[PDB]
Design a protein around this nucleic acid. Structure first.
Ligand SMILES: [K+]
Ligand SMILES: [Mg+2]
Ligand SMILES: [Mg+2]
Ligand SMILES: [Mg+2]
Ligand SMILES: [Mg+2]
Ligand SMILES: [Mg+2]
Ligand SMILES: [Mg+2]
Ligand SMILES: [Mg+2]
Ligand SMILES: [Mg+2]
Ligand SMILES: [Mg+2]
Ligand SMILES: [Mg+2]
Ligand SMILES: [Mg+2]
Ligand SMILES: [Mg+2]
Ligand SMILES: [Mg+2]
Ligand SMILES: [Mg+2]
Ligand SMILES: [Mg+2]
Ligand SMILES: [Mg+2]
Ligand SMILES: [Mg+2]
Ligand SMILES: [Mg+2]
Ligand SMILES: [Mg+2]
Ligand SMILES: [Mg+2]
Ligand SMILES: [Mg+2]
Ligand SMILES: [Mg+2]
Ligand SMILES: [Mg+2]
Ligand SMILES: [Mg+2]
Ligand SMILES: [Mg+2]
Ligand SMILES: [Mg+2]
Lengths: 122, 116, 86, 137
RNA sequence: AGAGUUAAAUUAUAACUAAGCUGUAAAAAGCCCUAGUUAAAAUAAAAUAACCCACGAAAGUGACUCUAAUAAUCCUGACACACGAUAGCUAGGACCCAAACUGGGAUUAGAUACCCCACUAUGCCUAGCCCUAAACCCAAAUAGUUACAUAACAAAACUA
């Protein structure tokens, strides 16, 4: 995967939630993106009230979409999701699996530094 | 753990710009500073206020304020006792940490060596 | 403003005393440094003063935590001297 | 006797009822302790004000109203007016840092009012309005 | 350098209660179109992490996301080319809040100062100019040595 879409949806019933995902994925495919899979994080109470499209939301559903897309089409996807009203907060980040966990050896102890002053009689 | 002192001070062989600019050199002295006396605060306030309530409610006569008057005297004696005994005992009580005089002698036996 | 109320920076009294609960709250703020932060936000300090304050706070924290280690390290050498009048 | 400092979360169901009502149903006592004045207001669970008191309204005037004793008297007066309307327990919210924080807390205690929870809601900007300049006294 | 985004605080604004509210070592002036609580845009500024010391040539940069991206197969070099905090100027837009100047209060022998209250330029965005700082780590760049050797003080001394 290359890009990850942290998608938060307004809490609603099963039919409209499926419809919202169906058209959101359709918008991604129109911009030239090959979506890998869709991950569902369930519905949870939002950490804080989020104001979007003249509404106050306290509960929402979380969904995650990962895809390969050209670099120039990220703005179009972000702009398209902003106009949509069934999505409360869209964010796009590079997929964390793109970077590899750098190998580590240990906590190297830093010795105290000497020779910071002259040796004259204080 | 002690904060690292690596690449902080302004030195000739230091590519990193200075991060610390101490007023006086970071050299451990052979003596510790004296304890600072605790600043005082007004005592017997929660007992004086209730005493004033009875005086204003009874035309400044202690015919019915005896309960409040005695507590005000008790607080004054209680505050007097603690104030006139804190100084002597606190010098050697040490709260588990040696008084400044003992630490000065201990440090003199194992002094710091800036020279040689 | 948007978060739930009566969750953050909240303590509950026990057995009906309130002076003890309040002191617990102050230790929470002092450890997290909010009490000093509110003191410094009453007026505005220029960024020139902010860095000069962080160069005195850090230096004190180094000297104090180093003199503290020496005291603990030399603490065992306080027993009665076995060679008095030797 | 396992006692937890953290408040009972509204989402859960904690069997800790004071005077027959739940935790969120208990009224609120807002305390704004500034550096020159202390204002105390008690409001219901529906945020409907019951009684209001401050160092200014209790006869203290000018510099005197900023002292601890003035805040202590305000706490006594506010509790008496609150107890008249029939409230036993209250959740006190402290606003700001000032010399009247301690006195107002125990002022409600000695005024015939019982507190169960203490909250500090001091306005803490996260970077916000630029405050006034320093005072070269 | 662009594009998109907002957590905590604050204000316009509405409801309710209260008669006072701000302010100081102490007061007055100001406000009463106010204060407390609940609900809440825009503008501006970026708690804790940071007891970390990273990036850039320097001045500088530490809220989040994406795009573009940090010269030289790795010496010195100007009056030439490019850049340069903050204040200031020209044109348009924004204005919570801070605030030179100015007005009021207080202090003082006087106070066109320190202290208190109000408000403007301005601090902000877009385009252009100005090219000044204790622009100071007062220590020039590149290779090195710990030998020789303490004016003083400081951040030890020296060679090409
Ligand atoms: K921030
Ligand atoms: Mg560098
Ligand atoms: Mg100096
Ligand atoms: Mg907000
Ligand atoms: Mg720009
Ligand atoms: Mg007046
Ligand atoms: Mg108001
Ligand atoms: Mg406006
Ligand atoms: Mg730094
Ligand atoms: Mg270079
Ligand atoms: Mg380079
Ligand atoms: Mg060159
Ligand atoms: Mg410039
Ligand atoms: Mg400028
Ligand atoms: Mg300008
Ligand atoms: Mg001109
Ligand atoms: Mg202009
Ligand atoms: Mg303006
Ligand atoms: Mg203003
Ligand atoms: Mg004047
Ligand atoms: Mg500089
Ligand atoms: Mg120079
Ligand atoms: Mg230089
Ligand atoms: Mg040069
Ligand atoms: Mg070079
Ligand atoms: Mg070199
Ligand atoms: Mg000499």
């Amino acid at each position: 995967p290359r890009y990850e879409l942290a998608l938060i949806l307004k809490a609603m019933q099963r039919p409209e939630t499926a419809a919202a995902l169906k058209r959101t994925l359709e918008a991604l495919m129109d911009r030239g993106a090959v979506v890998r899979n869709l991950e569902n994080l369930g519905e949870r109470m939002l950490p804080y009230k989020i104001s979007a499209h003249n509404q106050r939301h306290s509960r929402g559903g979380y969904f995650l979409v990962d895809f390969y897309a050209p670099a120039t089409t990220v703005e179009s996807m972000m702009e398209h999701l902003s106009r949509d009203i069934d999505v409360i907060r869209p964010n796009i980040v590079k997929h964390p699996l793109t970077q590899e966990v750098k190998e580590c050896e240990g906590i190297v102890p830093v010795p105290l530094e000497e020779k910071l002053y002259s040796t004259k009689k204080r | 753990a002690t904060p690292s002192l690596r690449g902080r001070l302004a030195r000739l062989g230091n590519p990193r710009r200075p991060i610390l600019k101490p007023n006086k050199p970071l050299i451990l002295a052979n003596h510790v500073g004296e304890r600072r006396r605790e600043k005082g605060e007004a005592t017997c306030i929660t007992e004086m206020s209730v005493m004033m309530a009875c005086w204003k409610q009874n035309e400044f006569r202690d015919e019915a304020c005896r309960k409040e008057i005695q507590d005000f005297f008790d607080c004054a004696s209680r505050a007097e006792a603690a104030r006139k005994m804190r100084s002597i005992q606190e010098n050697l009580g040490e709260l588990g940490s040696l008084p400044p005089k003992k630490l000065n002698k201990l440090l003199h036996r194992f002094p710091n060596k800036p020279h040689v | 403003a948007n978060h739930l109320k009566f969750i953050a920076r909240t303590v509950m009294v026990q057995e009906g005393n309130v002076e003890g609960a309040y002191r617990t709250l102050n230790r929470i703020l002092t450890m997290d440094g909010l009490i000093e932060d509110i003191k410094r936000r009453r007026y505005y300090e220029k960024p020139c003063r902010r860095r000069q304050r962080e160069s005195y706070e850090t230096c004190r924290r180094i000297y104090n935590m180093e003199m503290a280690r020496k005291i603990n390290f030399l603490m065992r050498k306080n027993r009665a001297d076995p060679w008095q009048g030797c | 006797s396992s006692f937890s400092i953290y408040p009972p979360i509204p989402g859960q169901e904690n069997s800790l009822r004071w005077a027959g009502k739940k935790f969120e149903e208990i009224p609120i006592a807002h305390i704004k302790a500034s550096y020159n004045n202390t204002q105390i207001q008690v409001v219901s669970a529906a945020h409907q004000p019951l009684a209001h008191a401050s160092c200014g309204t209790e006869g203290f005037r000018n510099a005197k109203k900023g002292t601890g004793i003035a805040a202590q008297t305000a706490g006594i007066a506010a509790a008496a007016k609150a107890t008249g309307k029939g409230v036993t327990h209250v959740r006190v919210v402290v606003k700001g840092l000032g010399p009247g924080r301690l006195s107002a807390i125990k002022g409600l205690t000695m005024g015939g009012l019982e507190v169960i929870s203490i909250t500090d809601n001091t306005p803490i900007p996260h970077x916000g309005c630029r405050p006034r300049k320093a005072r070269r006294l």
